[PDB]
Structure formats: C-alpha cells, structure tokens
C-alpha cells in the first residue's frame, strides 16, 4: 500500500490514496494518527455530494381524473447533481426510477417485402386501425408509420438480367422491381391512412437469402424529421422471414465504403445502397441507442435462434415469433412492448480518463443487481419505484475543469446531469 516508497511535496501526498497523511510520512491513517501528530493541522479536504436539480418523481396523488401532460411526468430523480471528487474516495449517490402509467408512443413498422411476405402483406392491409385500437389501451397518444425494404440493387445480391431487373420473380409472380428502402408513411395518427397506403404497395423479390433491412433500420433511425419521430418513446417493429446482411457483405458487390450513419432519402427512397456498405451490428447499436429506438424483432420461427442472438447485442431490443401469414403481429407487439417497458436499463456517457463508474440496483422482491447487472432492473410494473446506487471513483487529477456526463435509461430522453469537480489544490 501507501506504506512503501511514496513521498513528495504538497498536492501530491493528497493524490496518493485514502490513508496517506501529511502534517503541516505519506504512509497510513492509523499509523500517522497512531503516532504524535495533532488532528488540527492535518490535511483532508475530502469529497462531497450536492443535489442541485431534483424534481420529485411524479406520484399519482391527483387520481384517475388527472390526464397528465407528458412534459410534467418525471420518471427519474435527481436530474442535476454536482459531485466533488477526491482521489481514491468513491462518491456514491442513489437514483430513483418510477414507471409512469401513460406515455405517447411512436411506432414505425418496417417490413421485408421479398416474395415470401406476399401472404404477410395481405394481412397488414387492415393492421393500421386494429393496432391503433390496441396500442391505445396503453397510450393516449399513439402514432404509426410504415416502411418497406428488400435488398441492395447491385450484383451479386439481386440478379441483373434486364428481365429479372424488372420482375425478379417468375412469369406468373408479379414482383415489382427490387429496392433498398422505401418510406411508405412517415408517422401519422391516421391509422386508416396506414390501411389504404399499405394496401397499395406491391410485393417484390431478390436473389440471395438474407435481406438488407440493416440498410433500412439505419435510415429509419437517422432520418429524424423525414420519418417524424417526436421526443417520445420510439418503437421500431422490424418484421421479416430471413437473416440479415451486415458490414463486410458489401465487398462481394464492390461496396467497401462503410455506412456513414447519415440520411440519404430522396422521394422517400434510400438512394445510396450502391455506395455504402450495410451497417455493422455495432454501428446500429450506436445510432439506435443514440436515437432512443426500442427495437422489436418480429421474425418467423426458423430465424429465432439468430434474432435472439441479435437481441442480446442490441441494448433495449426484444424478439418474438411471427406466423408465416403475419396473423399474430399485434399480440407480438404488445408482448414485446410489455417486456421492454417493464425493464429499465441504465446507461452513462463518455467519462474522462481517471474516472470510473460502478452500479448497484435494488429492484422488486429484494432482487439486487451487481456489476454489469447493477444497471438493470426488470419486473417493473406501472407505478413501481426502483433505486440505483451509482458509485464513482477517481485515480488522479486530470482536467481541472468539469464533465457534464449524463446517466440515462435506454429508450428515454430523460437524463441525469452529473457534474464532476476535481479537488487538486492544497489547503
């Protein structure tokens, strides 16, 4: 420990550990304070907590007649905290999450349009109203969107004979020409508009099995105003009966430039499927997380093992089994939503070098999290409170300024501002 070879001037015996004392040698607490030194002149300018912004978690005191403004709801408390941090000394604080009953929900429906979803397409014709009706049990303000995708329109993923370039399928099969991504409907609350417009889409097809929905997910994530995302909870339903292309597959096609994570819509068409590689899983993780997109993988039985693995790599996702005729999507969505919304997962931002976080969770039934699990609580039903013990240390004095890193539950725009101020100078 600090008992061995360690001796310097002033602001260095300070930043050496918890124990090391110096009377105005740098060895221990219960050894320097065990030997003759007056606890008057001894130096210890230790670290403090200081809660600055802290609106109370909204309780339901005003009863069932209060239809509460989304902007009044407060799920996470504190909101702005200043933490004064000394070296080696953790400065821990608790954070209270409470699940509100009612929050506006944007849901985008992104679907495979290759020929095996012809059956599926014909069921989705009526989905707009039946899903609006259902979702409204859960939310007072629901908006719906629809987008389609098939594939990259290049050798070798589609066949490029002039015939198949216009009808990628057989003689009888009336497939439209292949496309990458089409925004059929940006977010509306007119579920019937969904119904008409979805029933005007024509089914397509392509060559290789896995499709290019990853090109699509990215655009849906990053083309804010063109999709119509409001700063509410955002659901992307991604439904398909095939696997997925991802970064690296683009090489085969000559595409070698990695996806830029930028919007490239024109007349509601992704234009650059020729030019950019499919995004990597990591890339999506970034842009989805950063755009608060909770993903619902609605995939068929035969691709469960895969999309389950995908699900574990995408924070704030969920997976469920789609029937071949897509008859069961609504239940799927509901189920996916319920599990999504009944588990909170806490994420922080970029720390600076000599600064580390630790998490401890305390959920219902006395189930307590630790380590990576310190930031998860599940089984949270409406109104439930959970707490988090967030614990931050430091090694030595880096930036003699401050860091405004935010702690945030994934899916929610609600944040917790945490201001670090490092104590370096002598006293």
């Amino acid at each position, epitope marked *: 420990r600090c008992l061995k070879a360690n001796a310097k001037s002033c602001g260095e015996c300070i930043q050496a550990g918890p124990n090391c004392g110096w009377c105005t040698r740098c060895d221990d607490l219960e050894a320097l304070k065990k030997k003759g030194c007056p606890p008057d002149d001894i130096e210890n300018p230790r670290g403090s907590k200081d809660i600055k912004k802290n609106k109370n978690v909204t309780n339901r005191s005003k*009863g*069932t*007649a209060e*239809k509460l403004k989304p902007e009044d709801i407060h799920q996470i408390q504190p909101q702005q905290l200043v933490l004064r941090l000394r070296s080696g000394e953790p400065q821990t604080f608790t954070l209270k999450f409470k699940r509100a009953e009612d929050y506006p929900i944007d849901l985008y429906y992104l679907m495979d349009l290759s020929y095996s979803m012809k059956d599926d397409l014909e069921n989705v014709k009526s989905l707009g109203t039946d899903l609006m*009706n259902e979702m409204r049990r859960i*939310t*007072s303000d629901f908006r719906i969107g629809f987008g389609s995708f098939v594939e990259k329109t290049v050798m070798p993923y589609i066949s490029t004979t002039p015939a198949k370039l216009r009808n990628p399928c057989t003689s009888e099969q009336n497939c439209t020409t292949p496309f990458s991504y089409k925004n059929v409907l940006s977010l509306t609350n007119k579920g019937e508009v969904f119904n008409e417009l979805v029933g005007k889409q024509r089914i397509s097809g392509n060559l290789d099995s896995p499709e290019g929905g990853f090109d699509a997910i990215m655009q849906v994530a990053v083309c804010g105003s063109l999709i119509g995302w409001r700063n509410v909870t955002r659901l992307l339903v991604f439904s398909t009966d095939a696997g997925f292309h991802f970064a690296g597959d683009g090489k085969l096609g000559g595409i070698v430039l990695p996806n830029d994570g930028q919007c490239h819509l024109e007349n509601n068409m992704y234009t650059m499927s020729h030019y950019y590689d499919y995004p990597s899983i990591a890339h999506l993780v970034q842009k989805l997380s950063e755009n608060n997109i909770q993903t619902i993988f609605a995939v068929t039985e035969e691709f469960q093992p895969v999309y389950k693995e995908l699900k574990n790599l995408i924070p704030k996702s969920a997976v469920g089994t789609l029937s071949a005729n897509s008859s069961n999507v609504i239940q799927l969505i509901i189920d996916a939503y319920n599990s999504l919304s009944s588990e909170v997962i806490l994420e922080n931002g970029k720390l600076s070098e000599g600064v580390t976080i630790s998490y401890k969770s305390y959920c219902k039934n006395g189930v307590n999290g630790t380590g990576e699990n310190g930031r998860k609580c599940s089984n949270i039903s409406i109104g*439930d409170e959970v707490q988090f013990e967030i614990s931050i240390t430091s090694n030595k004095c880096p930036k003699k300024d401050s860091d405004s890193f935010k702690i945030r539950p994934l899916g929610f725009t609600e944040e917790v501002e945490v201001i670090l101020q490092y104590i370096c100078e002598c006293e």
Partner: antibody
C-alpha cells in the same frame, strides 16, 4: 387472467355498518386504482370513490363522505369498502373495478348485494 | 357536477337492424389532449357491467366490430350494427373527466317482435 373476486351477499340491520372486500389477482395490485360503484334498482349506477393500493391516495364522491371508507391490504391484494349508518338508501349491489387515467374499468367484480332490513 | 342524459329509456329493435344510442353531457368531455373522455358500458341481465368503448371512439377487447362509438364534444352516440340477442341489456355512458364520475341513467335495449 385478470380477476376481481368480491365477498358474498350480506344481510344487515338499519343503523349497523358493513365491510365489503374485493380481491384482485392476475395483475400487480398497486398499478391500478380500485373503483367503487353502487347500483340501486331504479337509480342505475353511481360512482362512490377510488383508491390507490400502495399509496394513501383516495378520491371520494362527496355525497358519500362519512358513509363509505376505503382501505386496502397490499399483502393480500384486497380492497375494502366500509358502509356505515346503514339505511334503506344503502341497500344495493356494490361493484369494485379497475382504472388508470387513460383506461377506466375494463375488469369488474361480480358484485355484492347489501340489504338493510330489521 | 357533470350531468349525463340518456333521454331514451328503452329501444325495441328487430334482430338484424342497427341502432344508435345517444348520451349528452352538460360539459364538454374533450380534454386539451384531443382525447375526449366518454366511456360506454353494457350490462347483460344479472351480470356485471362490461366495458365496450373507451375514450369516445375506441373498442374494448373482445368487443365485436359491430359496436362503434363516436361523438361531438358534448353529444355522443353508440351504434350497434347487427343487433343480436347477446346485445340485449342496459347501455350506460360514463364521463371520466371530472370528480365525481357520472353515469347517465342507462338506456335499455330489447328485441322487437
């Protein structure tokens, strides 16, 4: 399988007081208000009050202040209503149900008839 | 506070015909939400009330497409498309905006013969 099971039929004498129970299963008890409604044959339905199990939040219909008292037991997922100073006005069937601000009274109890006769 | 009027006490209807049932409110149930808070319940004889319509227009689960609800800000109607024997009962409206919550005295619905 969301279910509200209410206590059996009760025979009372004028001036007495009675406590009806409503046991909730199939959902987390502390997530929903329990709603209390009175039905007399000839006056239809009448909202009495609502209470939030975990809290101590009640909203009474003033007409019934000092007639109906609301309590819950979180450990046995049961809502209770107490009717006191029973008269012939209090003889009815009494329903508990369930509500959130956005979605009111989807599931109901089977009802409990309170008869006030000497 | 808020008064719900269901003027018609009962409506005899030949099975197969459609019916509108109306409810009025002395105050607009329209919230600043855009959500208007009127509910519809049906009580089959000797059974408890069942939710049919929530927030003016939306159907409760298990409720057939035959049932449809719409309305002004103060005048609302429930339309049943093909009245069966199972739709016989008392139809109550309910306001869920102001304490205390108020039902209209319901309208009974019976078969013509």
């Amino acid at each position: 399988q969301v279910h509200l099971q209410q206590s059996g039929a009760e025979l009372m004498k004028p001036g007495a007081s009675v406590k009806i129970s409503c046991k909730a299963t199939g959902y987390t008890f502390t997530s929903y208000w329990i709603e209390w409604v009175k039905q007399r044959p000839g006056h239809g339905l009448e909202w009495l009050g609502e209470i939030l199990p975990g809290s101590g939040y009640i909203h009474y219909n003033e007409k019934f202040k000092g007639k109906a008292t609301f309590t819950t037991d979180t450990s046995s997922n049961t809502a209770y209503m107490q009717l006191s100073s029973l008269t012939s006005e209090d003889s009815a069937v009494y329903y508990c149900s369930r509500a959130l601000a956005l979605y009111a009274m989807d599931y109901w109890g089977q009802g409990t008839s309170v008869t006030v006769s000497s | 506070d808020i008064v719900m009027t269901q003027a018609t006490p009962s409506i005899p209807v030949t099975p197969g015909e459609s019916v509108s049932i109306s409810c009025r409110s002395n105050k607009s149930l329209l919230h600043s939400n855009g959500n208007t808070y009127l509910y519809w319940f049906l009580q089959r004889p000797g059974q408890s009330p069942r939710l049919l319509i929530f927030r003016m227009s939306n159907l409760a689960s298990g409720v057939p497409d035959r049932f449809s609800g719409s309305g002004s800000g103060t005048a609302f109607t429930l339309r049943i498309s093909r009245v069966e024997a199972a739709d016989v009962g008392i139809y109550f409206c309910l306001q869920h905006l102001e304490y205390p919550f108020t039902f209209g005295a319901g309208t009974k619905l019976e078969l013509k013969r």
